[PDB]
Amino acid sequence: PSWPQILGRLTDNRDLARGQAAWAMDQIMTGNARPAQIAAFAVAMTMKAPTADEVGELAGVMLSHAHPLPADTVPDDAVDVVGTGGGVNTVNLSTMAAIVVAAAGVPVVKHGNRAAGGADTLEALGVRIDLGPDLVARSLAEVGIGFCFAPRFHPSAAVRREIGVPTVFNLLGPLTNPARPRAGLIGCAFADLAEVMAGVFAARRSSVLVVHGDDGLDELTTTTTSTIWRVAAGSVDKLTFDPAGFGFARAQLDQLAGGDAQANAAAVRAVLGGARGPVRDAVVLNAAGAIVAHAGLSSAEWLPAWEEGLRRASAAIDTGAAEQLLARWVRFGRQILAA
């Protein structure tokens, strides 16, 4: 593979040959690509319709250059809870849902970066996001949730300053979690990429629900139905989900909207403290979706899994388990943590 061969193929409106996406991504990650090459390739791969083979290569290479967690520190049953975003932002919902899932006893391992987001809302809550692999492993063990801060794990494409627009590279987070959880609830704002991502997770034998609100939300919505790509036993089933089937009132899109880091942090405290309304509803639904994906690792009938997921999610909040998990998480980071 070479850049001319690859860029020529792209300009010809063709998909890449096997291995070409991997080679290009590896050149970038090792510092061997020039700004022009990075930019042309990033823009081209954002314009062209995505494929599972190419995305799998891109994400696989990105993942291979990440620091892993120390051996045997990630519970076999750990889950991710994340949206891709992409004018959609549900960092509010995803953050709250992650804390609820962890409080329900399912280990959560998230990953990401600051917003200028995910990480900023966590810092606004007092969570210490900037930890090395050993200490993230210790948080997972001791608190039941960990956060893999991108700068610390993926050292390893500042051309994004160069060109000032996001690219496909910014949408691969769910496939590049350094802790490699085998289950998850993955929200995606673009239906074409959601289906592709589902195919990658199937190839990895993950138990994941890839979710897209039929209102465009990158989470399970409460305003209408959602599309779910249910990934289990190496295969994908696409279906429709109606939360009214579990007693959830239809909400309005603007009721679910996030804000800045401080606005988000206030809502997290409201919801964890028991405030009821459209936001809590959406949090419980997405937490339940993650718990359903987790259940999928071990077996599980769909409707009963949902009823159990929703029971566990609601209880995590209503028992105060969630509010207290957050307190323990803040407490952990404030300790004198030694290597």
Add this chain to the structure above:
Amino acid sequence: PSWPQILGRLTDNRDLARGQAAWAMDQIMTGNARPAQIAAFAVAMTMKAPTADEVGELAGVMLSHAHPLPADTVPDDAVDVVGTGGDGVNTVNLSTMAAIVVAAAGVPVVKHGNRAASSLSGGADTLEALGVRIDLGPDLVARSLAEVGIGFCFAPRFHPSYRHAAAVRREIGVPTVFNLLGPLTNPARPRAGLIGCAFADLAEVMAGVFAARRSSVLVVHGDDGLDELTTTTTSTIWRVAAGSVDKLTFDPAGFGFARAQLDQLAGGDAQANAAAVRAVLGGARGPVRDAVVLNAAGAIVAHAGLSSRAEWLPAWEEGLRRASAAIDTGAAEQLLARWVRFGR
């Protein structure tokens, strides 16, 4: 307009808004673009289906930076004769020969182009192997037009480069739409031409741009992929005149041309091309001569369309007569000799 706005629109799978292509091109040409911005924009604009509005903007900017010829030195009836190449297609042999034949028939020809290693279908090397002096200034191209009947604008002389051009070229290493717009950036601005294009989508788009320019042009694409009127099969012609595009299928068998095989038409290096030019101009019959005549006649037809009273079949008949006679009477061979003498 801004780079983030334009690059974002492109990644969104949208066409650009009016003025945005021109802005971007001019930022590049005035030295206000980072290597990543140049490469992202050029690649994106090569991947997206072209549009006449955008290609018009890009070409108009590029043409605004070109070195013009001196006032009153390009005849009103001058024509271009060019194949764009691209897609592995190279008919520099046919195009070079057709241009000399057209000029020898008495229709002024003004071309621009580069050496083979600096362009998709630059035939400057073939001209040079024939003994023609290719790197002349605007004044001497003007004199060549008047005294020989044909002028050649060497691209590095008439088209300035842009900041980071060398690094971008080296790093991406493939042609972009920046290399495909030659027919619309000819510094002598001839109002007629035969324009061969290897990409039917871009051919149709360029026809639209020429139409809005009030040009009389035959934009052509062989149904075998050739960037010329082919003898292998039918061709699409976008016949442009008085502001409209008449898209038709063309079959040279209607004028008695025998079907050839694509291989029989193949070019080679500059020395192989120069040997073939001498042979064809010396009267050597066969598939190559046929293709040259067909394309020279196409240029003469474009030339005839500068008058609103031109009739298609009679124009073809006359163009085919004039092109054959230019070879047979030795006029083409004589013109080439004179062109060689001129540079000395």
